[PDB]
């Protein structure tokens with residue numbers, strides 16, 4: 001998986017170990033080796049949700065395949081829970097866009113996963 | 115809808131209240147309340163368009179329906195107009211990628227929309 | 229094409245002229261005029277790949293056509309090669325998401341490409 005979180009929460013409010021925790025939790029949820037997991041947290045953003053710049057997040061979760069999608073709900077509970085507990089963002093001010101990529105459309109190590 | 119603008123315009127030339135302006139304009143364009151509108155503006159970016167570092171933008175509009183058909187062109191007129199008038203970016207140095215999301219691929223508030 | 233690189237390598241490591249280099253290399257690889265190419269480099273990011281904060285990147289290449297099995301493999305060697313040589317990022321710590329955009333779904337200059 002590749003998980004990206006864009007948030008207006010400041011850098012100082014992102015706990016030490018947060019990328020580690022995302023990685024470990026994504027490994028547990030997908031059941032796939034953690035060595036392939038990419039995580040990206042982007043704090044201090046100029047963002048609003050519902051016209052308010054209270055804490056919010058816009059996220060992306062990319063997975064590689066064709067039959068992917070069934071775990072989206074489970075991921076939403078997991079990831080909203082992490083953003084709430086760690087970054088103090090209300091789950092109702094988070095969107096997570098899920099993208100199931102074709103292997104031929106993901107590059108890695110000089111080629112693609114096709 | 116979720117609207118994201120990445121630009122090399124500096125933060126100081128982003129007007130005060132610009133997030134609210136985007137939200138309001140999208141509320142009018144959609145005919146739906148501001149409540150579920152998310153906006154994200156990213157200034158100060160290292161960008162080039164056409165080999166030039168004159169002001170430019172790369173944008174995304176994600177919507178669960180409410181796009182396609184003649185709506186993408188209408189959005190482009192609205193959103194290029196706003197970026198030209200407020201951020202002083204030439205419309206010919208803006209790209210906007212439109213994404214018609216499936217509700218099952220959008221997470222929010224611990225769940226997904228379908 | 230539109231090429232975006234998100235990386236934890238510092239801004240201070242990005243060579244002067246890297247945006248121009250990416251623009252020219254993309255032109256020659258995709259066969260598209262440099263005048264239409266957008267590049268966006270985002271350094272200093274809070275990222276991990278495989279649980280490690282060693283240099284890594286998450287990239288996107290959007291194109292209206294010119295995306296496919298064989299083309300993407302070639303692009304991956306080219307783009308990993310530039311990230312390795314210029315930014316010192318190992319190719320096995322890079323993902324590139326390729327998006328074949330329909331012209332109807334790309335806004336530009338107050339309108340869309342189709």
Ligand SMILES: */C(S)=N/c1ccc(-c2c3ccc(=O)cc-3oc3cc(O)ccc23)c(C(=O)O)c1
Nearest residue numbers: 001002032036037038062063064065103113114
């Ligand atoms: C998150 S995106 N986890 C992840 C990343 C890469 C891979 C993986 C492949 C996925 C899908 C494929 O069709 C082929 C894959 O091949 C490899 C090959 C090597 O060497 C490493 C990883 C992948 C997975 C995965 O499911 O295997 C998961």
Ligand SMILES: */C(S)=N/c1ccc(-c2c3ccc(=O)cc-3oc3cc(O)ccc23)c(C(=O)O)c1
Nearest residue numbers: 115116146150151152176177178179217227228
């Ligand atoms: C921008 S992304 N505006 C937005 C976001 C979500 C929703 C909305 C749904 C949209 C599409 C669906 O198929 C189902 C939706 O269900 C809900 C349910 C709840 O509780 C809140 C919002 C949505 C809208 C929308 O206009 O309804 C708009």
Ligand SMILES: O=C(O)c1cc(/N=C\S)ccc1-c1c2ccc(=O)cc-2oc2cc(O)ccc12
Nearest residue numbers: 229230260261264265266290291292331341342
């Ligand atoms: O001509 C192209 O293949 C093209 C390539 C681009 N490169 C990266 S995203 C961007 C845009 C276009 C293009 C473009 C691409 C597809 C299409 O159907 C129509 C197009 O029309 C154009 C008109 C113009 O004045 C300028 C460019 C286009």
